[PDB]
């Protein structure tokens, strides 16, 4: 998993930015969704699904901008 594992590394790095953006009912809920993201990459065995994971996380940060 030289490509899948790396994917997991980028997702967590973003996680730190979420907790640093604020701290409340909106901020706390946003990060919870992020946890789900980490679990999926772990399940990723090897294929063209890694691309789908990168797109989903992109949405999470987008919400951060709205707030």
- Method underlying the structure: NMR
Q: Domain tally for the chain? A: 1
Task: Supply the DSSP string of 5-66, one letter for each residue.
Answer: HHHHHHHHHHHHHHHHH--SHHHHHHHHHHHHHHHHHHH--SSTTHHHHHHHHHHHHHHHHH
Listed in sequence order, the residues at least 6 apart from 56 whose beta carbon sits closer than 8 Å to its beta carbon are: 37
Distance from the Cα of residue 52 to its chain's centroid: 12
Domain CATH number, residue 45:
1.20.1270.70
Parent domain of 49 = 1-67
Residue with tokens 């946890």: 35
Cβ atoms 8, 42 nearer than 8 A? yes
Question: Helices 4-21 and 25-43, interaxial angle, to 10°?
Answer: 170
């Amino acid at each position: 998993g030289s490509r899948v594992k790396a994917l997991e590394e980028k997702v967590k790095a973003l996680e730190e930015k979420v907790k640093a953006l604020g701290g409340g009912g909106r901020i706390e809920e946003l990060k919870k969704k992020y946890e789900e993201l980490k679990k999926k990459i772990e399940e990723l065995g090897g294929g063209g699904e890694v691309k789908k994971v990168e797109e989903e996380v992109k949405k999470l940060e987008e919400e951060i901008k709205k707030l």
